[PDB]
């Protein structure tokens, strides 16, 4: 069933990639999707590169059903790993 109002819940996203161009494009796409959605963005921030892997963190606050649906529809490029949670 539907996720309900998601009061006080946050979407937390961690991105990884070997290609910094791909990671920054995916980050931008996630930000745009969230903001067009009526949600707010925290970050994104870069972390220090580890084992030649670029890392970004971004969160989405006050997500709506339209936010979640827009994120699902978004096609993220091959070569970027996205870990995502809601709570």
């Amino acid at each position: 069933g539907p996720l309900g109002s998601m009061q006080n819940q946050r979407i937390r996203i961690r991105l990884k990639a070997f290609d910094h161009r791909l990671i920054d494009q995916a980050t931008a796409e996630i930000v745009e999707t969230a903001k067009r959605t009526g949600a707010q963005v925290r970050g994104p921030i870069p972390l220090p590169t580890r084992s030649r892997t670029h890392l970004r963190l971004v969160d989405i606050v006050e997500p709506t059903e339209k936010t979640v649906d827009a994120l699902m529809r978004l096609d993220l490029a091959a070569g970027v790993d996205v870990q995502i949670s809601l709570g």
Partner: protein, 139 residues
Amino acid sequence: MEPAARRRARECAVQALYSWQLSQNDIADVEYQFLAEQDVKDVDVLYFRELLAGVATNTAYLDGLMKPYLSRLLEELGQVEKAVLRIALYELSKRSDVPYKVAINEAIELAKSFGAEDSHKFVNGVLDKAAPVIRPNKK
């Protein structure tokens, strides 16, 4: 120079200015949110605040300084590199309380930490050309 807290402030400023580049949120909200959610107990927070505000209020100027050195790139400048170079150029041009060599060296170290492969060599090359124009005394 410089104190570890100021080094940490510049590190945090790269992260926050990356945030601002990507989110397009108001810089006042970026400052508030970053400081509310990030661990800054070891940071010169005043310097961090002054860096965001300064880079944000001089971005056209800073990007103008940077533009000629980007003329050969086939790809858009990376977001981390853009943040690092904005900060470095800002410090060279407005924060003469930061020694010339510190501003340059710390930019190279930030590119090494956060940037693309060989990012730090690119940053070194840009600053080697731009820095003596901004601070002709090299101090």
